[model samples]
Target: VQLVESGGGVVQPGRSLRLSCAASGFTFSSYGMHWVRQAPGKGLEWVAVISYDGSNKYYADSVKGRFTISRDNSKNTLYLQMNSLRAEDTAVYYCAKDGSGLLDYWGQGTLVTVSFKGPSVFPLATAALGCLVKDYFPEPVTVSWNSGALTSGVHTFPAVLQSSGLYSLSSVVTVPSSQTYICNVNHKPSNTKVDKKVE
Candidate 1:
């Protein structure tokens, strides 16, 4: 579905937030639509769902009382409202169509960010380094490591996302146990960096 999300992007803690998703490209009344969210440095959450007829809806207890999912049959749009938002609720909210109880088409998510920080903690781990670069947005990051003056010959494990949008990726690098490495993490959207002088 061609999903359009609006009324999101920024909201402060304890504030009320409203989001909308207008869907098209198929018969809107024949299928169901649902709401899901991905928190900063966390997993995807299935929030709530509403059937096409608007007579049936289901919400996970995670947000059953805090969130409301509704629809406008005349506009063919779905709306979501959350009261008293928290910093941990700063995330991307998405809408999707249901295909036999499975997510069918998707939407370009709306990102929600508050006063946030990139919590990248790279601790040395027995000749290796565990780099959990989390709590950043909108998605993806570039983190490089240097052993003393050499940036080569370092065996790097595939980066992964452990939490918060997953910060999208967490990585590990194999280094010489003798120590000393300058970890450089660069997040796009402006080409900024965070340095970790990991031992």
Candidate 2:
């Protein structure tokens, strides 16, 4: 069985959003669906859960009133509805199926960014090559210089959530002016890799 998540996007501060995960290859009512979330650079945390019988529900205090978890048995889908969005609510969300006693099957994460700022700028150095990655989600990106063998001069900033509800990341590396430098950006969620070459 597999879980596919969707409905992730930008929502204005104090707004609302609903995220969904569709189940396949198994009966959705046969297991419990659990919601887990991870903020940028933070560890995973449980948010909500609904048992297979639909008679039991549990929610974390952090989102007690702001979130609601439900399921559509007919469509084999699970939902997470959130209100009063805040910056802390911005994160990647996943739905996992609890089998027996533990979570066994999980969905690919969906990113939800609370609306905030827009694009910003950064300065370059005389011998520094800078790479910018923009508008990506599910936040597992790898930025490296010359395939990452040389790591001492590389500097990477944390992923920043843009107003577009996607994320932007940047990295800089100092390299000799006469040599060729390649800045590689690997966005694994989309199976996309980008290489920028400079001299």
Candidate 3:
């Protein structure tokens, strides 16, 4: 299925908001929809997910019923609704499919601000001082090795959306020699930060 965003705009606090995602080139009955979130300067959390067969629904431990997700099999649209907005709710939101709990394809994230906030950090790395999360959002979050240091190439791990609307990213890097390594997560409209450090 293809992913398309509804629109982009600002919403006031304590107001209800609805984000829509349209899918095409596939049948909704054959696939599922997964929701995730990224707060300014924080890791991703899984919000919730719905299956195509309407058989099961899974959510993160942190989010029980605060959020609801629905899909239109005919229209091939997925909806995410959040109520009682707060400043902490501001962040980038994404809709994806649970390729068996592994995030394979992802949509471009929708930026949402609860109050006036900045950027967040999501980093993961491995021994030999390799870095991960160079590109923080919009799926296939790129990976790169820092120069000036003997570091191995970067690799990405499968990402998952928690019930609380956050994404958890993990990765592995291998450096042949011992050196200081820096892992950075870069997203647009916000500052970049490193969640992983190696020595």
Candidate 4:
């Protein structure tokens, strides 16, 4: 199978752009499609994924409903849409096919950019922590506190596929005061640890 795009290009921010991926060599209904991002100086970020049957969808914890992925089984194509783009969205975007629970085929990345905007921050008493699993296969991954201290109340969020092959997990904890906390992601194959200090 192969993926093809429409002749129209250059989508402006806040406008809708439909890019299609057509499959030729194989049956599109047999495989799933995923979307990803490669920002400047940053690693690949999982975006979203759609099942072959176009019934299920998974999104990364970091990303909201701003992005979406859909597939057309009759046309053997996949579509990706993004809205309210910002300068941060000016990165190489790619579409890939899921293979053996991992990304096996990748499409040529498309670069899109938006004008600069003023700095803004949204404050909240709770903070979000995210982690992505790639390269190695992991099962039953979870995030939890590492230290014996259990002063803070932690809540585990459901892990989302984020993309076709990549998996993302997140957690939020409410602390009484600003202090150092440990964020541990445990998986069957390996484990990752991170430290967060709130101020």
TM-score winner: 2
Comparing 3 and 4 on TM-score, the stronger one: 3
Clashing residue pairs in candidate 2 (N, C-alpha, C atoms within 3 angstroms): none
Best by lDDT: 2
The list of candidate 4 runs beyond 4 A from truth reads 4-13, 116-199
lDDT (C-alpha, whole model) for all candidates:
0.71, 0.80, 0.62, 0.59
Model 2: worst 10 consecutive residues (lDDT sum): 116-125
Error in Å for residue 165 of model 1: 15
Candidate 4, residues 1-199, lDDT tens digits: the string is 4554442334556765556666777878888888777864579987788987988998876555676778889978888777666546656677788975587887776665442111111122344432232322223355555454643566655544323323444556665443455555455334343343333
lDDT of 1 by residue, 18-127 (tens): 88888777667777888888986679888889987898888978665678888887778888888867766778888988886698788988987653335455555536
Error of 4 at 23 (Å): 1.5
Candidate no. 4 TM-score: 0.51
> What tens-digit string does per-residue lDDT give for candidate 2 at 86-105?
98887899999998547788
lDDT of 4 at 137: 28
Of the candidates numbered 1 and 4, which has the greater lDDT value?
A: 1
Q: Per-residue lDDT for 101-195 in model 3, tens only?
A: 88777888887765312224434332433333332333324334453243345455666544433344655566565445665544433444344
Q: How many backbone clashes does every candidate have?
A: 9, 0, 19, 9
- Residue 185, candidate 1: Cα error in Å is 6.3
Off by over 4 Å in 1: 114-199
